[PDB]
Amino acid sequence: ICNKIPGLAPRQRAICQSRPDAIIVIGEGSQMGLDECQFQFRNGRWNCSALGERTVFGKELKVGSREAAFTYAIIAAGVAHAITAACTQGNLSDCGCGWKWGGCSADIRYGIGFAKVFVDAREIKQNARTLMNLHNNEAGRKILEENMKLECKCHGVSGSCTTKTCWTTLPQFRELGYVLKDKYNEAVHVEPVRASRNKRPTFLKIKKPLSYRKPMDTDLVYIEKSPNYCEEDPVTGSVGTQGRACNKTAPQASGCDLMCCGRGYNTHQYARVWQCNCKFHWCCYVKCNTCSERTEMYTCK
Template sequence: MDTHIMAVAVCFLFISRPVELDPFGCFTSARRICSAFQTDDKSEGFVFSRGFGRKHHLQQDPRPGPPTACHLPEPPRCHHHHWGRRSAGHQRVPVSVSLRPVELLCPWREDRLWARAESSKEAAFTYAITAAGVAHAVTAACSQGNLSHCGCDREKQGYHDQEEGWKWGGCSADVKYGVEFSRRFVDAREIKKNARRLMNLHNNEAGRKVLEERMKLECKCHGVSGSCTTKTCWTTLPKFREIGYVLKERYTTALEVEAVRATRFRQPSFLRLKQSRGYIKPTDTDLVFLERSPNYCEEDTVTGSAGTRGRLCNHTSPLTDGCNLMCCGRGHNTHQYTRVWQCNCKFQWCCFVKCNTCSEKTEVFTCK
């Protein structure tokens, strides 16, 4: 398997672990897939930039030819809000897809909340966008000629409709290859035969299905004096931002389901809508969850949620770190204090360092 494909896929899995705590103890399942993600296709391999500008290099086999081995160091935990991709000749493309802030920014460490969050609609969103992201990244790399085992879609060649006068041309994105790789790579983690497995596999497939449904057809006209005697067409990937927006909408309408056990082996065999009569199954592009999300705004000893009271917030930010969103409408307190530090330090001969004392008045804001 091509090392570059593995690199892209591994990075997506690392930045999208469904339930994990960042250094501040925050729930970052959805933000992790929107973490800073950059790739530079250079001779030394991919460069993954995650969290505070730190870089980690995938070290490839120094021998010529297609890469045969790579090493991915343990990634640092990060808490950025943007995801992007950059390849040779391309600018970094940021994507910002965030869920409601109260579902992202509340600190918790209790096992009860951890387990519950793994079956929530936030986890559903995370799995879906991760699977779609792996498929999108691999397909894009294939189209750009960066991978040795794939390329353009070979099925889209020659005339498609002679009466309408257009034919396949250019390099059509081979989304089938990307989707199949995502299916084999991402779904391989689901080995336990339980309801969580059914939920995760369904959401993975929903994310990939959304990507497939939004493939675009682009055409270029050919003819004398600007006429369009014939057209050459090819399929292209949508911007990943579009996929994020669609899955965000699916997240808001996610369906609660329950597993139906097989009569013979008593193992979960399929999912049905929990509030329905009979065995109504969710559609292929529905996001599904098993347990309702905890109330991340308020402290709850039953679920283990710590709430957002006392959390630091930014009173000028409209984003998830802003007081209006993080404090869940309760307002915020303003605290003033004087910060003191050593400044203008100079080396004196011989031999000591002399510093001035600087200070400034500053404010911090916490949720009520």
């Protein structure tokens, strides 16, 4: 059934045929990772979109730059987060579990163990790009593991901490997206390592001076220089900045002067509806009128 789904390795498709329901959740997680990447880079010249066909893991990057590192890290983190959250929601029944003796094993370990193997199974080939890819996926999983919130409650003799329980919770994915954005702002350059006997690269070490150590497992790692991303070029996968909106102001990466790479801006009276002034409840439908005055949206030429 899913043997035709684009962008999966043969082992990934075998796993898909094994358990249809896990694939739904993992696809939702990959989509969540891609959506978070696109929200984080909404104002950037590279809006986390690439020239290519749609896959479960989005359009793949033809250059191994910092953008690809962040994309793969967020994809892996989203997959693991979705697996764990679906397990805790009751959407997955085989997850975790035993129950009457030991209270069942942890959820996060199951989620990470499944997501690690499946996501890394896409790396069918072996190349410096592949080692970078595996490093970035592992970094995403490690950063997701770091951001788990630990909570404890005491329920001892009366309310005392004679006996207290501690449990971990998944971080809400926007916070993890911000953390991975911060990590992306400090990604490290690398080249692979090669020896006479092995004849192929096994691991990777830092390019940047003052050090030659292996990059830390929680660092986002990239091997290729980043293009300008505002010129349309299929050899590099850049979609170009043409047609994208801009704020026509000084702030970095948001102004038309920086968005359009010197080509200027085109504007028109857009007049957004901008519905406002509602009597909000804690959720759900409320009645209110709209206040659409005017706007002139500037877009790159």
